[PDB]
């Protein structure tokens, strides 16, 4: 379509060597839209774990999203880091079935607390009919549900924004975490999810997480591939 740079027809896909190292170049179709969310969960939650100093830099490796922007992703050579990545992969695989409502990184002072001192949450929306109509409370939903899929390049922009905001939030905005804490991954199944379906690594629970009444809330950003949407949020005592 742009003949000032190419005689070939334009394709809704990302032409970048660095991007392809971590993410699918096409995200418009249902499977690759879902594959993108899986990679997004892995990348963003890796960034959060590292940037908040929840796990030391030994558990991570240096990656790039663009030539200008780098991040720390969990390393598959380290066994404990690998076990966490599998957690994240299992939760990500549940977006293919369409069963995952929210996955949150939950920080508490004592192990087992239902009330957190810091939460990084990623809430999902599933679309049908060409990825246009949302399937069906929360403040983000009304807006994000109406949000259109605007191409691969827009998704890359949204991903770059999220990682920059995370690195900026954790470094320049949030206070350091207390000397003692328990970090946890907790998720919420959708209503469509069968009772026999369980995400590997996650034991069932009658408790999610609760917040303080005066805890602050900041939005990191959103993602809108072809057939899915995600909303990233942070509640924190350290704000």
């Amino acid at each position: 379509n742009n003949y000032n740079e190419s005689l070939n027809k334009s394709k809704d896909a990302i032409d970048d060597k660095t991007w392809s190292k971590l993410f699918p170049s096409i995200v418009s179709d249902p499977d690759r839209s879902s594959n993108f969310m899986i990679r997004a969960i892995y990348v963003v939650f890796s960034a959060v774990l590292r940037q908040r100093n929840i796990l030391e830099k030994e558990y991570f490796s240096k990656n790039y999203i663009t030539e200008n922007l780098s991040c720390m992703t969990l390393s598959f050579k380290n066994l404990r880091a690998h076990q966490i990545a599998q957690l994240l992969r299992a939760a990500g695989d549940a977006t293919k079935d369409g069963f995952l409502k929210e996955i949150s990184l939950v920080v508490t002072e004592h192990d087992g607390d239902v009330e957190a001192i810091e939460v990084f949450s990623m809430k999902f929306i599933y679309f049908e009919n060409g990825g246009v109509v949302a399937r069906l409370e929360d403040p983000h939903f009304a807006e994000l549900a109406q949000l259109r899929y605007e191409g691969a390049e827009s998704v890359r922009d949204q991903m770059v924004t999220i990682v920059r905001s995370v690195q900026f939030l954790c470094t320049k905005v949030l206070e350091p975490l207390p000397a003692e804490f328990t970090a946890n991954f907790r998720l919420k199944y959708t209503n469509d999810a069968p009772s026999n379906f369980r995400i590997d690594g996650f034991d069932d629970s009658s408790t999610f997480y609760t917040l303080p009444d005066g805890i602050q809330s900041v939005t990191i950003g959103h993602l809108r591939p072809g057939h899915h949407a995600a909303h990233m949020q942070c509640w924190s005592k350290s704000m």
Binding site: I84, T182, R186, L187, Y189, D203, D204
Partner: peptide, 13 residues
């Protein structure tokens, strides 16, 4: 209604 909690967790002492 239904929730899931990771079996492995991260502690700092």
């Amino acid at each position: 209604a239904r929730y899931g909690v990771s079996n492995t967790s991260i502690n700092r002492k």
